[PDB]
Amino acid sequence: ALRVTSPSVEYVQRPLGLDAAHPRLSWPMASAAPGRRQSAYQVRVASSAAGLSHPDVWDSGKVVSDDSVLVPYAGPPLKPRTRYFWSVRVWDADGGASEWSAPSWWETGLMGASQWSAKWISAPAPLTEAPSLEGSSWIWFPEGEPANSAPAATRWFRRTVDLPDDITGATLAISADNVYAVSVDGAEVARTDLEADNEGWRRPAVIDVLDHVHSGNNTLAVSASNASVGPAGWICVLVLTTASGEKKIFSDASWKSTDHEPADGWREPDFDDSGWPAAKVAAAWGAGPWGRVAPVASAANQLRHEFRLPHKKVSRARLYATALGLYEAHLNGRRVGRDQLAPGWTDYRKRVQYQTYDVTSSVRPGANALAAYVAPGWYAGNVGMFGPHQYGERPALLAQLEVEYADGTSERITSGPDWRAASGPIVSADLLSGETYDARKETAGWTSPGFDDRAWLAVRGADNDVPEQIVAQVDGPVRIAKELPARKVTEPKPGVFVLDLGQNMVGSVRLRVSGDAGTTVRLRHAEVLNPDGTIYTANLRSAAATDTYTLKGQGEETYEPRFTFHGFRYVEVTGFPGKPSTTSVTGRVMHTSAPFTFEFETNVPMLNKLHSNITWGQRGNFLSVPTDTPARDERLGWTGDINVFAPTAAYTMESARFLTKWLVDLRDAQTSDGAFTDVAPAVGNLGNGVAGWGDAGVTVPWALYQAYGDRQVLADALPSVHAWLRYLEKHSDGLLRPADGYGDWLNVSDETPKDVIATAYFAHSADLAARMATELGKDAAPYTDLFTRIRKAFQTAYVASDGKVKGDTQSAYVLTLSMNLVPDALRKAAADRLVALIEAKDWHLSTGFLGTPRLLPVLTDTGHTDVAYRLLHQRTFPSWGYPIDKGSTTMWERWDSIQPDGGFQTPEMNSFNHYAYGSVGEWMYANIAGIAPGRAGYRQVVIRPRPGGEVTSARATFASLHGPVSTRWQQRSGGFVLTCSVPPNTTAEVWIPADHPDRVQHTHGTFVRAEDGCAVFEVGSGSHRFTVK
């Protein structure tokens, strides 16, 4: 009979902390018998599993309907903090009922900010702010008015200061317009370089100088240089921490200065500077051209609170938490959950996502401790090419622990003013720069009760802007999905070890190391190597991606970063005591917690590698937001890249929750006049209203609808889509769009006119809007009319009588054919011209970001699958095979990220992990695996494998919302066999290539017609076989 397998709610089994008013239920079904359909369903919801026999929440009754996917709960209003148990049964076409599904559950969260009583808290100023320059002065040589203008020259400065006894700490914060070199008692402690200066004065350095300072007289010496005629000055504070208190030494007129290069020895204590004039104050801090310059601190501080709970039986405990920043929570000596980088990146002004954890087994009678690390993340740390403090200056925590007891009583413990804070071991934590950890600074026992925190500091109430909304997390939290042990160790320079993980991955490592306390190991991360085996990092640009660990000297130490991530295949290890082995470093692969949903294997090793690389490029860039690259100083939610890649993404991973979440980010960023931004979340003032980029607001909801049959994503998008079309029509002339935007980004010397691109995308968005309106049962006429008018304008402007398209590029034909812009009479001619251009490039593509995803599909649509296969199997540059032969394990940003001569493309922009060119995937899955949606969400599957090129054998399984869709085919000794599995409540259209269609043997289904050299069959669910001999 028919049975329900793996029922889900909002795409997952047993969601915890789900705030949806009408959660959507799904019931994949299984049957060993073919041809099964659902005629009806009945859902029950109750407050207990046992209670489902007499349900107290909802009973839908028997509902006549074949709906089995994303069916919205339609009972009484759901309440916060409540677990709802549910079961479904179905009736088949003959009216026989299934068993009730094994009871499952979902649990609501807080359902809005009003249910929180917690307060936002931060570590206090001594722990969050770097030593400040306030109270100090910018100084220079006494010449003119240096804050206005000084010569392009070097000046020299000296100060001898009598330091206090019992110094326990010493820090120097220093900045110069334009550069400096500073020494203590003749030893250089810091410098900046002219040839690297880009307004370096804005970014003071903070240096630990305890190793060079002592009590009594210390001689400080500074050289500073001005880069050109204009303002000059340098500023510092030396902060000495003592047993007594704090002592500060400033840059000021007590310093001596000279404008003539001094004799050598000028940095030494006993040098004679009695003839030097006093330095001149150029401006007090905050004055001059420089403003309120401050060094940046990025500690991940420890926050904790101990509390007593009653000695009663616990029924349930939940922790609800979030941060402006990142956090990791601990309760009674045990880490809470397995999420990384919680709560993820949203526009924190508009929303922050919160997490719900089951901590029933962790709570104790009597004494308890709740604790957290709180780090800068995207909220306060470096973001893209834009520096830190994008949303706020320092991170904040919100936490609410609810304990329910068997007697019906409860306790609530919250973040608030009674919590205490300490620096702990995470000295610095930045997504881009890396994490710095000193194991000697650990505070053993801090996450457990009975801990001595008298010398910890009171927390402050956070001064952060309050998010408008606190929302249950929509996407799968980032979690470690796999470990990659190092596969070999090399030593390309003495004491510099490089460990190869064998795959370009995203996450961070586990380091295992034994040695003396105070030994510091440095870990740098790279996507590629230099020809000499050293790591190449120039393409990372300003992202250091460096983690630093200082040992505590206790056995085989383990270091795992928490508040950073990197994109890398190779790890360079320096400062290691002895020689690392393969066990010393292990990659921890991190991404959204969503299943992989497409298994694909052919007889062709190169295609199998291509598929692997696609899935690695996807997972590497699916951490909180869909990123362009996970490695360099960017990692932004680029609309264009996800536009092109979304249809492929939705084959290979369950991408519904992930891209649903992202589309909320995109709509949060849409401008008041309706323009979608180039990136979302919107940071760095990058721009908006770009064809092929902003259009992701239309194309991504449509891609999700096609793959999943998710109608809610269309309903949620259509208003923003309307506003986008209004914006586009306003910014056009006779419906032709300007030649602006990124265009067919990174094409191979075949640049498509940007007005052709822009007008084409405008038409396509109108087309998709009409399709959305139609699916939702709304009036589609206005959108259809708009599409008609744009297509007419497009054809008149850009399409010639012989079918040539303006620009005559591969992408010009690909886009116009794909988007149905070529007049029907001229499709043949346009496609012939495309093939001619490919032939003229010696059977190579020339397409960039926008052309590539549509290239092979258009070729197949126009009767040139053989050409598609020629391009697919191509191994020389440019092609998919070319990087694979060079050892790629992901998709590269450029067709020539490594050039034919072996050199790298320009580090100004050159990533080895962009998913855009992995858009070939959808062609393979639809045409080699033969798995494509005939109706949205695979309610009907079109099974049309097209054997060709080198492919004689293929097998695939797609995990659709209805259950598995599988194919297996083989050409052997003239014959062809295809087997497939089609899940209950769906149907298939199967195309079997044959010289004689009516001769095709088949266990199930009905021959309906011969078309395009195939027997076409319509078949219901089941395990089918087709044979041609």
Ligand SMILES: C[C@@H]1O[C@@H](O)[C@H](O)[C@H](O)[C@H]1O
């Ligand atoms: C304040 C001023 O800012 C920039 O124009 C340069 O960094 C210059 O050298 C500096 O003097």
Ligand SMILES: C[C@@H]1O[C@@H](O)[C@H](O)[C@H](O)[C@H]1O
């Ligand atoms: C304070 C002290 O005085 C003298 O011994 C010299 O001037 C010496 O260099 C200085 O550091």
Ligand SMILES: C[C@@H]1O[C@@H](O)[C@H](O)[C@H](O)[C@H]1O
């Ligand atoms: C390459 C492939 O990718 C995903 O399906 C899983 O991580 C699987 O374990 C791995 O082998």
Ligand SMILES: C[C@@H]1O[C@@H](O)[C@H](O)[C@H](O)[C@H]1O
């Ligand atoms: C136009 C934009 O340019 C690069 O800087 C991004 O990494 C992204 O791939 C692309 O869409």
Ligand SMILES: C[C@@H]1O[C@@H](O)[C@H](O)[C@H](O)[C@H]1O
């Ligand atoms: C998040 C942040 O918000 C504002 O300060 C600006 O829009 C800026 O460009 C962006 O980076």
Ligand SMILES: [Ca+2]
């Ligand atoms: Ca200057």
Ligand code: NA
């Ligand atoms: Na959850």
Ligand code: NA
């Ligand atoms: Na449905």
Ligand code: NA
């Ligand atoms: Na002297």
